[PDB]
Amino acid sequence: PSAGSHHNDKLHFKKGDTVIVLSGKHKGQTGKVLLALPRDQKVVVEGVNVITKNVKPSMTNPQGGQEQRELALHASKVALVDPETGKATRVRKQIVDGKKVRVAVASGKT
Amino acid sequence: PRAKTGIVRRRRHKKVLKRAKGFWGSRSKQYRNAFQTLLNAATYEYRDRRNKKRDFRRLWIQRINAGARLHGMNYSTFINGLKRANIDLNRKVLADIAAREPEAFKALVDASRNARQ
Amino acid sequence: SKTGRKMYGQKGTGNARHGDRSVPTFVGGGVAFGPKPRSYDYTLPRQVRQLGLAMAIASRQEGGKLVAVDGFDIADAKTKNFISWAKQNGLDGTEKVLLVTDDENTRRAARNVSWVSVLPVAGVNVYDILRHDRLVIDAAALEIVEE
RNA sequence: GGUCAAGAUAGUAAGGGUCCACGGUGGAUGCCCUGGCGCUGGAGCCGAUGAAGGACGCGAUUACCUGCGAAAAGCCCCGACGAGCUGGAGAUACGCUUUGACUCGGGGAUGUCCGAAUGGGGAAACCCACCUCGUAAGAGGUAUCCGCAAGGAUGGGAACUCAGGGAACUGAAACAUCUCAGUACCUGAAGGAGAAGAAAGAGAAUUCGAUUCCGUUAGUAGCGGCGAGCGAACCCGGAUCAGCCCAAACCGAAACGCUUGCGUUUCGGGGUUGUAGGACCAUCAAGCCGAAGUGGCUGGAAAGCUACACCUCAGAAGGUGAGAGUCCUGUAGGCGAACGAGCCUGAGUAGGUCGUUGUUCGUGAAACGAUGACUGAAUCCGCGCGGACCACCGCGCAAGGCUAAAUACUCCCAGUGACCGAUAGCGCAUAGUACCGUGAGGGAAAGGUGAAAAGAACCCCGGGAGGGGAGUGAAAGAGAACCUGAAACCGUGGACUUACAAGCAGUCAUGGCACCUUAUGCGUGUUAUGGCGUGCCUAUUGAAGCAUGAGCCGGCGACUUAGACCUGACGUGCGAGCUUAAGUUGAAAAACGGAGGCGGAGCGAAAGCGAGUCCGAAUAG
RNA sequence: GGACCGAACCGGUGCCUGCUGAAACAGUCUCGGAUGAGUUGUGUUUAGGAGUGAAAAGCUAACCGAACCUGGAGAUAGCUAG
RNA sequence: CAAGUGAUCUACCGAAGCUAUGGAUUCAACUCGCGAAGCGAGUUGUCUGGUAGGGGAGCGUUCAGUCCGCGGAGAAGCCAUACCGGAAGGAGUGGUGGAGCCGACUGAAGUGCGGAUGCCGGCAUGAGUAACGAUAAAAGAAGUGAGAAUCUUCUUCGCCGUAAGGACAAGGGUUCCUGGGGAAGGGUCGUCCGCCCAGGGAAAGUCGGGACCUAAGGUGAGGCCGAACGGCGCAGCCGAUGGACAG
RNA sequence: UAUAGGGUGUGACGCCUGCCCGGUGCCGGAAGGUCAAGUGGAGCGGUGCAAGCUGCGAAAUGAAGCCCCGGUGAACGGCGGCUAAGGUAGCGAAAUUCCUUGUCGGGUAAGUUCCGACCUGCACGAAAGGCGUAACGAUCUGGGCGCUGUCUCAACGAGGGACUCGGUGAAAUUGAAUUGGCUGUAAAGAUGCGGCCUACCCGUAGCAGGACGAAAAGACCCCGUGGAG
Ligand SMILES: CC[C@H]1OC(=O)/C=C/[C@H](C)[C@@H](O[C@@H]2O[C@H](C)C[C@H](N(C)C)[C@H]2O)[C@@H](C)C[C@@H](C)C(=O)/C=C/[C@H]2O[C@@H]2[C@]1(O)CO[C@@H]1O[C@H](C)[C@@H](O)[C@@H](OC)[C@H]1OC
Ligand SMILES: [Mg+2]
Ligand SMILES: [Mg+2]
Ligand SMILES: [Mg+2]
Ligand SMILES: [Mg+2]
Ligand SMILES: [Mg+2]
Ligand SMILES: [Mg+2]
Ligand SMILES: [Mg+2]
Ligand SMILES: [Mg+2]
Ligand SMILES: [Mg+2]
Ligand SMILES: [Mg+2]
Ligand SMILES: [Mg+2]
Ligand SMILES: [Mg+2]
Ligand SMILES: [Mg+2]
Ligand SMILES: [Mg+2]
Ligand SMILES: [Mg+2]
Ligand SMILES: [Mg+2]
Ligand SMILES: [Mg+2]
Ligand SMILES: [Mg+2]
Ligand SMILES: [Mg+2]
Ligand SMILES: [Mg+2]
Ligand SMILES: [Mg+2]
Ligand SMILES: [Mg+2]
Ligand SMILES: [Mg+2]
Ligand SMILES: [Mg+2]
Ligand SMILES: [Mg+2]
Ligand SMILES: [Mg+2]
Ligand SMILES: [Mg+2]
Ligand SMILES: [Mg+2]
Ligand SMILES: [Mg+2]
Ligand SMILES: [Mg+2]
Ligand SMILES: [Mg+2]
Ligand SMILES: [Mg+2]
Ligand SMILES: [Mg+2]
Ligand SMILES: [Mg+2]
Ligand SMILES: [Mg+2]
Ligand SMILES: [Mg+2]
Ligand SMILES: [Mg+2]
Ligand SMILES: [Mg+2]
Ligand SMILES: [Mg+2]
Ligand SMILES: [Mg+2]
Ligand SMILES: [Mg+2]
Ligand SMILES: [Mg+2]
Ligand SMILES: [Mg+2]
Ligand SMILES: [Mg+2]
Ligand SMILES: [Mg+2]
Ligand SMILES: [Mg+2]
Ligand SMILES: [Mg+2]
Ligand SMILES: [Mg+2]
Ligand SMILES: [Mg+2]
Ligand SMILES: [Mg+2]
Ligand SMILES: [Mg+2]
Ligand SMILES: [Mg+2]
Ligand SMILES: [Mg+2]
Ligand SMILES: [Mg+2]
Ligand SMILES: [Mg+2]
Ligand SMILES: [Mg+2]
Ligand SMILES: [Mg+2]
Ligand SMILES: [Mg+2]
Ligand SMILES: [Mg+2]
Ligand SMILES: [Mg+2]
Ligand SMILES: [Mg+2]
Ligand SMILES: [Mg+2]
Ligand SMILES: [Mg+2]
Ligand SMILES: [Mg+2]
Ligand SMILES: [Mg+2]
Ligand SMILES: [Mg+2]
Ligand SMILES: [Mg+2]
Ligand SMILES: [Mg+2]
Ligand SMILES: [Mg+2]
Ligand SMILES: [Mg+2]
Ligand SMILES: [Mg+2]
Ligand SMILES: [Mg+2]
Ligand SMILES: [Mg+2]
Ligand SMILES: [Mg+2]
Ligand SMILES: [Mg+2]
Ligand SMILES: [Mg+2]
Ligand SMILES: [Mg+2]
Ligand SMILES: [Mg+2]
Ligand SMILES: [Mg+2]
Ligand SMILES: [Mg+2]
Ligand SMILES: [Mg+2]
Ligand SMILES: [Mg+2]
Ligand SMILES: [Mg+2]
Ligand SMILES: [Mg+2]
Ligand SMILES: [Mg+2]
Ligand SMILES: [Mg+2]
Ligand SMILES: [Mg+2]
Ligand SMILES: [Mg+2]
Ligand SMILES: [Mg+2]
Ligand SMILES: [Mg+2]
Ligand SMILES: [Mg+2]
Ligand SMILES: [Mg+2]
Ligand SMILES: [Mg+2]
Ligand SMILES: [Mg+2]
Ligand SMILES: [Mg+2]
Ligand SMILES: [Mg+2]
Ligand SMILES: [Mg+2]
Ligand SMILES: [Mg+2]
Ligand SMILES: [Mg+2]
Ligand SMILES: [Mg+2]
Ligand SMILES: [Mg+2]
Ligand SMILES: [Mg+2]
Ligand SMILES: [Mg+2]
Ligand SMILES: [Mg+2]
Ligand SMILES: [Mg+2]
Numbered sequence A: 001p002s003a004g005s006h007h008n009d010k011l012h013f014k015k016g017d018t019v020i021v022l023s024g025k026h027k028g029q030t031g032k033v034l035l036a037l038p039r040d041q042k043v044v045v046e047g048v049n050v051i052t053k054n055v056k057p058s059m060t061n062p063q064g065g066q067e068q069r070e071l072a073l074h075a076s077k078v079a080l081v082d083p084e085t086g087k088a089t090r091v092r093k094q095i096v097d098g099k100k101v102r103v104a105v106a107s108g109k110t
Numbered sequence B: 001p002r003a004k005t006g007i008v009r010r011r012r013h014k015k016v017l018k019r020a021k022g023f024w025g026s027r028s029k030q031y032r033n034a035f036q037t038l039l040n041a042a043t044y045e046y047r048d049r050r051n052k053k054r055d056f057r058r059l060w061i062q063r064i065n066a067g068a069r070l071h072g073m074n075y076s077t078f079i080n081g082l083k084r085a086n087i088d089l090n091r092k093v094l095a096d097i098a099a100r101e102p103e104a105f106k107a108l109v110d111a112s113r114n115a116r117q
Numbered sequence C: 001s002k003t004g005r006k007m008y009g010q011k012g013t014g015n016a017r018h019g020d021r022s023v024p025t026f027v028g029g030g031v032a033f034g035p036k037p038r039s040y041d042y043t044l045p046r047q048v049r050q051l052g053l054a055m056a057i058a059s060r061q062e063g064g065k066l067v068a069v070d071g072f073d074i075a076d077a078k079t080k081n082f083i084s085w086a087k088q089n090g091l092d093g094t095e096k097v098l099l100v101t102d103d104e105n106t107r108r109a110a111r112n113v114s115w116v117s118v119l120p121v122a123g124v125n126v127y128d129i130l131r132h133d134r135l136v137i138d139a140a141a142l143e144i145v146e147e
Numbered sequence D: 001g002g003u004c005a006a007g008a009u010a011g012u013a014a015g016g017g018u019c020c021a022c023g024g025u026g027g028a029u030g031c032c033c034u035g036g037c038g039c040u041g042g043a044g045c046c047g048a049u050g051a052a053g054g055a056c057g058c059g060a061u062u063a064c065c066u067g068c069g070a071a072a073a074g075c076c077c078c079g080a081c082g083a084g085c086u087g088g089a090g091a092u093a094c095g096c097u098u099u100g101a102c103u104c105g106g107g108g109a110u111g112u113c114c115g116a117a118u119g120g121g122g123a124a125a126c127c128c129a130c131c132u133c134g135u136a137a138g139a140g141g142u143a144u145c146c147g148c149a150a151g152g153a154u155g156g157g158a159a160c161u162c163a164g165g166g167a168a169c170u171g172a173a174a175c176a177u178c179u180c181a182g183u184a185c186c187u188g189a190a191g192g193a194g195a196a197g198a199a200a201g202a203g204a205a206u207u208c209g210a211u212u213c214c215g216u217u218a219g220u221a222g223c224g225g226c227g228a229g230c231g232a233a234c235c236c237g238g239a240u241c242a243g244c245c246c247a248a249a250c251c252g253a254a255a256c257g258c259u260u261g262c263g264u265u266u267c268g269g270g271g272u273u274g275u276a277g278g279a280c281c282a283u284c285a286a287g288c289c290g291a292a293g294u295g296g297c298u299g300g301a302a303a304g305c306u307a308c309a310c311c312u313c314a315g316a317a318g319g320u321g322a323g324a325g326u327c328c329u330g331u332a333g334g335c336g337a338a339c340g341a342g343c344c345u346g347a348g349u350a351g352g353u354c355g356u357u358g359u360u361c362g363u364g365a366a367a368c369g370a371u372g373a374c375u376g377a378a379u380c381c382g383c384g385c386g387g388a389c390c391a392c393c394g395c396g397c398a399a400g401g402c403u404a405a406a407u408a409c410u411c412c413c414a415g416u417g418a419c420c421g422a423u424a425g426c427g428c429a430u431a432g433u434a435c436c437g438u439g440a441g442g443g444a445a446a447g448g449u450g451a452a453a454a455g456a457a458c459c460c461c462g463g464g465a466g467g468g469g470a471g472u473g474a475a476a477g478a479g480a481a482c483c484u485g486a487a488a489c490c491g492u493g494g495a496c497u498u499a500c501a502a503g504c505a506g507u508c509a510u511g512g513c514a515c516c517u518u519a520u521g522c523g524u525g526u527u528a529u530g531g532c533g534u535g536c537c538u539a540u541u542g543a544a545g546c547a548u549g550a551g552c553c554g555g556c557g558a559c560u561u562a563g564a565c566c567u568g569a570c571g572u573g574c575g576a577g578c579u580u581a582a583g584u585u586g587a588a589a590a591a592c593g594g595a596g597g598c599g600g601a602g603c604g605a606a607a608g609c610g611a612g613u614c615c616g617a618a619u620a621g
Numbered sequence E: 001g002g003a004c005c006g007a008a009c010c011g012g013u014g015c016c017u018g019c020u021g022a023a024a025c026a027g028u029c030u031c032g033g034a035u036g037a038g039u040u041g042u043g044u045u046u047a048g049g050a051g052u053g054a055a056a057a058g059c060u061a062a063c064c065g066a067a068c069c070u071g072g073a074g075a076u077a078g079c080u081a082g
Numbered sequence F: 001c002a003a004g005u006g007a008u009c010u011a012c013c014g015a016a017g018c019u020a021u022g023g024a025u026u027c028a029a030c031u032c033g034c035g036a037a038g039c040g041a042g043u044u045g046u047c048u049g050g051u052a053g054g055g056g057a058g059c060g061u062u063c064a065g066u067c068c069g070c071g072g073a074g075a076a077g078c079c080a081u082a083c084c085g086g087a088a089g090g091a092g093u094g095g096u097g098g099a100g101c102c103g104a105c106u107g108a109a110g111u112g113c114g115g116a117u118g119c120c121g122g123c124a125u126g127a128g129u130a131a132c133g134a135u136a137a138a139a140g141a142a143g144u145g146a147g148a149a150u151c152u153u154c155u156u157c158g159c160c161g162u163a164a165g166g167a168c169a170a171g172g173g174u175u176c177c178u179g180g181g182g183a184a185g186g187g188u189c190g191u192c193c194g195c196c197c198a199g200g201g202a203a204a205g206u207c208g209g210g211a212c213c214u215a216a217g218g219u220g221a222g223g224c225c226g227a228a229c230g231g232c233g234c235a236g237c238c239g240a241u242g243g244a245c246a247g
Numbered sequence G: 001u002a003u004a005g006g007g008u009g010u011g012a013c014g015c016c017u018g019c020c021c022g023g024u025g026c027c028g029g030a031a032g033g034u035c036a037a038g039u040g041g042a043g044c045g046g047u048g049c050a051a052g053c054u055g056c057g058a059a060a061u062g063a064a065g066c067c068c069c070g071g072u073g074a075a076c077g078g079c080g081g082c083u084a085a086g087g088u089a090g091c092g093a094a095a096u097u098c099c100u101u102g103u104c105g106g107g108u109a110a111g112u113u114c115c116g117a118c119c120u121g122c123a124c125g126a127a128a129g130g131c132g133u134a135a136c137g138a139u140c141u142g143g144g145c146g147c148u149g150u151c152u153c154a155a156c157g158a159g160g161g162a163c164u165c166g167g168u169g170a171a172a173u174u175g176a177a178u179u180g181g182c183u184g185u186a187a188a189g190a191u192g193c194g195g196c197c198u199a200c201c202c203g204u205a206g207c208a209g210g211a212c213g214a215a216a217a218g219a220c221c222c223c224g225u226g227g228a229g
């Protein structure tokens, strides 16, 4: 059945990080990474929004409503930023948290 | 490499089915019977292309000696007497149309009656 | 085809005649005259081999063949300097071009970019040169005469 | 205008017909890959420490699959990775995780019951015991066969290997010999291969030098109801290449052998052969690092277009709203582990007779090997062989063993493809399932919303099903009976038409009516009347035939592939000369390789002679 | 008492009916046996040129002058179709 | 009142035979581009029914290399069509469709369907026909429900009664009970059901079996045979259909 | 364990069971003929100088078996033509008889059947048994009584279908169909060709003459250098 993501199941960003869409609608928009889904390659962000009319199941709501909620994307929001736009990024060095590498583009860290 | 029939059969088939047009019953909607009808239609076509010329010969002849008998002649007699008169060589088509213009066919009858006395 | 024995009655069932279910008339059965693995290779006469390759080179000399004289200057192995070298030898960005040489580095600017199909010595073949426009034959053994 | 008369003609459609238009059925065709297929290469045994294959269980919730095994979608240690995870599952709730989870590489530990099963029985997964340890709960033992004992064997395994056994259809245009064929099949033994192997040989050079496999000799030499047909080897070219140990004469026993310094099985030394020797006496597994693009434009959305620009040992490839070198994932290159893979020299023998058989070996002049019954020797001026047999000449040393590699196969893994792409491709886009059979056994079809569930809250008719709106979306001309969506087949509407008529259904001709987007002489559709007119195919002397075949449409569906084969035509390269095979080296491609094959001389039964040769005593063919 | 009549039971005589059946062997009516060479249950043994058979070439898992399944195997097809 | 018939004379009809006009093919000759035949031709003469069969030129499908390019302002496929070519066939335009694809040259084929009582699948005709599965009948009232000839309740009626009642073994496998359901199965219906969903129900010292026994038969240490696998066989062991045994 | 067991044919019971051992089988005989391997090894040949090594092979002898002799029938068998023998009893136009419905008689109005006689037995006959036989028989054959829808000869009535309405809804078959009669012609039996006649369109209930109607690639027949028992 088609198989899942081919990106070696590797997300290019954490759930913490700020990020910007670089394609489709919402290109240029930015937000925090509210949900990362590496194996399915999917990214929750406060950018994309969608009005999900959950079907009324009277589950405390006899008549149903229409919630406004953000609908996830994938490796099309671009990674972290720093000179105010998306960037390719590189593994760095040790810090006072010396067990860690950070990131940079043509610049500093994230 | 495989090379299944794909597009080809349907296209020949549609060519026959479109030749079908107003063919009664399956003759126009099922391929095989349309094809077979067109075999016999070939027969009829070529032979009629021949026949139609016998047909119009016959019709002009009918009209020509009808006019010839309007004046007391007949096709045998009128055609021969015209032939005897410095060979007129009007076609049988053309002699009919002069059976739509009576004053002339009349003089052709008098002329054939001449070269014959 | 992996299918059985003798399906039903040879005679008197009112059906058609058949006997097993593994046959080209049956959907699911075998193929008559299907392809099998096989060879295709043969020994073309040797004199025609060398004659062809020579006519190949020749047909290129009649318009645009080129002879790399005992080395090009390409800094280290960087491709960018191959692109400069070829641009200064009139190899635009346009024509697809073939290249033959022996030093590792000069080919290690072998990044076909609508450019630079690459062979060593003895790799030459009528196909690979006839396949390209200009031939940047390596001038050295390009005319070290045989025998 | 009115009546009467005579005559001519219109419209009506129960229904039907041709054409058009719009749907429904159905799932062809196009696109696609979640799945196959082959070739190449790699890798190749599991099990009494329990295999292969199963049963029954393990989940908050579990029917199926996966994983596990009462310590049960799991437990412990090490390495890796560094934010997720909470299996497929698309499900809510409980939660776990920088103290490094999860996933990946490696080890340990747990591992019910059945199954070689093996405490005993048994209708597989169950029923019944006994012995020891234990407070019980629980733990351990209890099969036969080799061994003193350590220890080993039972079983399983696609194809491959060896072996005991061993068909017929079929060809011979019938059929016995012969062939199919030592094929199919059964059975045994084993391994990652096995087999075979170190000349009592091949063979006619006083040459070679284990075995195996490939080319070649060669369809030669031969075998053959001399029919059908079967069919070698030597030389020569390559892949690969090693040969090593015993029993025996002779020493030291030691035990049991006997009239007295000896002789049957043992243990060291010693000794291992033919140009006779020995004696005794002078790198790969997990993984990490990895160069380079921004603006404008059409778009629902950009990777597309365009303007400038960059990298390149990296333009292989996938992914991302349509096609991205520079957005993501990336062997181009680079690094990488705890700790894990790699005087003697062989007797019931050689030899023989009887019955047979292998080898090209069909009893043939039949050697030789191999044997089932009976018999039965020599040993270095010795013994076997050179295709009845003899002599000479020549090649070998049986009657003891072991032995890598070149060889085969594909359950498994990776890469590749003038292979497939949903009637194809494995039977399976997954199921040996559903279904059929007491059984052995047989055995299906089946794919597709959208980029993203944003999967349609709310409203209307309906018990529902179904639908109409609204809303999401580029699109609902995608709405879950969810890509396209042909044809048969069923319907609705419309044009033109049909209720005096005889019909292979068409064809020609003309009139009428209708419409004008390859299209106003032009047609196109329909229609009335006239003429003409015996479906198709097969099989046949002869088919409309009351002779075969077929309900209709769609898709599947039949002159191919092979071999240094043969013989022709055309074309190409060399040309009195022409070409390689097996293989070796390089492969983003080819080159090498004269072993050998074909021209080159013919006549003959053969010797053989040779522009000549055969018959034959020279004249003839 | 391989005696009689006759239910159960075992059977299958003649007619009709059924014949894309209610049923791949039946139904109603009628008829044979019915203490015997009888009927029947469970367990079990004999099979393919083989078994069985108060004997028809019967039966051997719904069509037995040699069962079924798989395999040789794409047997062979001077024949018919295409 | 020849449209009968013997002789005779003419005029006309009448075929795809002959002819006129146009044009194409086969072969032959004559002319030319070339540098070589022969290609493309142009002219005249000429030829041109056809089964098995020989020969020649070609059309179309998939796949491959190369070129040229098209595509979301829309590919292929599908549909209509009066255009074009000598044929196979090809293009234009419009409609659908939603992402891949023409043309040219060369190469390779699983390459061209009406037939095979061919194969798989779909849909027709027979036809709203035959049938609805024992000739043991059914009637009314009341109830429930969206909806009842068919479900429930009441009262009658008819049918079996060595059964068409009842209890078991075999076999089946939750079909049992309750509460719901109503797509499909039910030969019609359906509110019902042996159907679908969920939950519950099944209790043994004494009944049957086992921890007891032996029959036919099976199996079998040792033992007797046998190309293999294997065949026999004493004791023993297994085996109820029978023996033993407390409600 | 011979009063038993196997095989074979006959088939309660009664009277019985004839002629033919040439051929075949079986049983017995044994002077002679014949007959394998083996024993025997006269002699013939190759090769070698030789010793010797070697190919072939004759008489005599050598079993069973067969030729030869005898017997054998509830052994296979035979019992006739205008051979070894040729039908003893019984029965006979028969489950056997061709000519045939033989001839006579019985039964009937009338008897190709059936009963009885005869014999001229195409082609009866004695354990593949002959001829009888009470009783038995869903046996087969011919008569009689009784009774009746079997019939002259059909009627009336019943129920279950068939018919009409509402529900569910098949099948075999189907080249396509706008699918008449006569006569003629055609591969010789015409809706479909020719001529002539007849006939407005469409159904429903019914009948079975055609559509060489349907079903099973004729089981007869021939063919195949086909198959099987
Ligand atoms: C009527 C009863 C059966 O038919 C026949 O006997 C015979 C029918 C034809 C007349 C005959 O044709 C004739 O052949 C001749 C050789 C030639 C002749 N030509 C000249 C035309 C032809 O006319 C045959 C061969 C034709 C062929 C299709 C066939 O084989 C038919 C077979 C069976 O279906 C039939 C039955 O109807 C089934 O009845 C069965 O009876 C059993 C007792 C029941 O238990 C039941 O079985 C469960 C039932 O069903 C099976
Ligand atoms: Mg004419
Ligand atoms: Mg297949
Ligand atoms: Mg009037
Ligand atoms: Mg109407
Ligand atoms: Mg693949
Ligand atoms: Mg296991
Ligand atoms: Mg649980
Ligand atoms: Mg499980
Ligand atoms: Mg435990
Ligand atoms: Mg860890
Ligand atoms: Mg991780
Ligand atoms: Mg998930
Ligand atoms: Mg056990
Ligand atoms: Mg044990
Ligand atoms: Mg056991
Ligand atoms: Mg033969
Ligand atoms: Mg085996
Ligand atoms: Mg084994
Ligand atoms: Mg060699
Ligand atoms: Mg760009
Ligand atoms: Mg020997
Ligand atoms: Mg011998
Ligand atoms: Mg012979
Ligand atoms: Mg010898
Ligand atoms: Mg020998
Ligand atoms: Mg010799
Ligand atoms: Mg020796
Ligand atoms: Mg393809
Ligand atoms: Mg398939
Ligand atoms: Mg399909
Ligand atoms: Mg079943
Ligand atoms: Mg089953
Ligand atoms: Mg999807
Ligand atoms: Mg609603
Ligand atoms: Mg709804
Ligand atoms: Mg819609
Ligand atoms: Mg759609
Ligand atoms: Mg559908
Ligand atoms: Mg729906
Ligand atoms: Mg729906
Ligand atoms: Mg799509
Ligand atoms: Mg669709
Ligand atoms: Mg209307
Ligand atoms: Mg209409
Ligand atoms: Mg009219
Ligand atoms: Mg007409
Ligand atoms: Mg004939
Ligand atoms: Mg004819
Ligand atoms: Mg007909
Ligand atoms: Mg016909
Ligand atoms: Mg038919
Ligand atoms: Mg050759
Ligand atoms: Mg009695
Ligand atoms: Mg019986
Ligand atoms: Mg009965
Ligand atoms: Mg009685
Ligand atoms: Mg009685
Ligand atoms: Mg037998
Ligand atoms: Mg049977
Ligand atoms: Mg059955
Ligand atoms: Mg058979
Ligand atoms: Mg066959
Ligand atoms: Mg064979
Ligand atoms: Mg045969
Ligand atoms: Mg002419
Ligand atoms: Mg002309
Ligand atoms: Mg001309
Ligand atoms: Mg002609
Ligand atoms: Mg011609
Ligand atoms: Mg478009
Ligand atoms: Mg394509
Ligand atoms: Mg077209
Ligand atoms: Mg798209
Ligand atoms: Mg084909
Ligand atoms: Mg067809
Ligand atoms: Mg045809
Ligand atoms: Mg049929
Ligand atoms: Mg069908
Ligand atoms: Mg009925
Ligand atoms: Mg109410
Ligand atoms: Mg009631
Ligand atoms: Mg009722
Ligand atoms: Mg009831
Ligand atoms: Mg009440
Ligand atoms: Mg009861
Ligand atoms: Mg039970
Ligand atoms: Mg109930
Ligand atoms: Mg219902
Ligand atoms: Mg439901
Ligand atoms: Mg119903
Ligand atoms: Mg209903
Ligand atoms: Mg209930
Ligand atoms: Mg016991
Ligand atoms: Mg016993
Ligand atoms: Mg036994
Ligand atoms: Mg016993
Ligand atoms: Mg009991
Ligand atoms: Mg008791
Ligand atoms: Mg008890
Ligand atoms: Mg009690
Ligand atoms: Mg008898
Ligand atoms: Mg007698
Ligand atoms: Mg008489
Ligand atoms: Mg008689
Ligand atoms: Mg009388």
Ligand SMILES: [Mg+2]
Binding pocket: none
């Ligand atoms: Mg009388």
Ligand SMILES: [Mg+2]
Binding pocket: none
């Ligand atoms: Mg009679």
Ligand SMILES: [Mg+2]
Binding pocket: none
């Ligand atoms: Mg008498």
Ligand SMILES: [Mg+2]
Binding pocket: none
């Ligand atoms: Mg007699």
Ligand SMILES: [Mg+2]
Binding pocket: G128, G129
């Ligand atoms: Mg007798």
Ligand SMILES: [Mg+2]
Binding pocket: none
């Ligand atoms: Mg008798």
Ligand SMILES: [Mg+2]
Binding pocket: none
């Ligand atoms: Mg008598």
Ligand SMILES: [Mg+2]
Binding pocket: none
């Ligand atoms: Mg009796």
Ligand SMILES: [Mg+2]
Binding pocket: none
């Ligand atoms: Mg009778």
Ligand SMILES: [Mg+2]
Binding pocket: none
């Ligand atoms: Mg009587």
Ligand SMILES: [Mg+2]
Binding pocket: none
């Ligand atoms: Mg009535």
Ligand SMILES: [Mg+2]
Binding pocket: none
């Ligand atoms: Mg009519």
Ligand SMILES: [Mg+2]
Binding pocket: G185
């Ligand atoms: Mg006639």
Ligand SMILES: [Mg+2]
Binding pocket: G190
């Ligand atoms: Mg007639």
Ligand SMILES: [Mg+2]
Binding pocket: G192
């Ligand atoms: Mg006609």
Ligand SMILES: [Mg+2]
Binding pocket: none
């Ligand atoms: Mg007629």
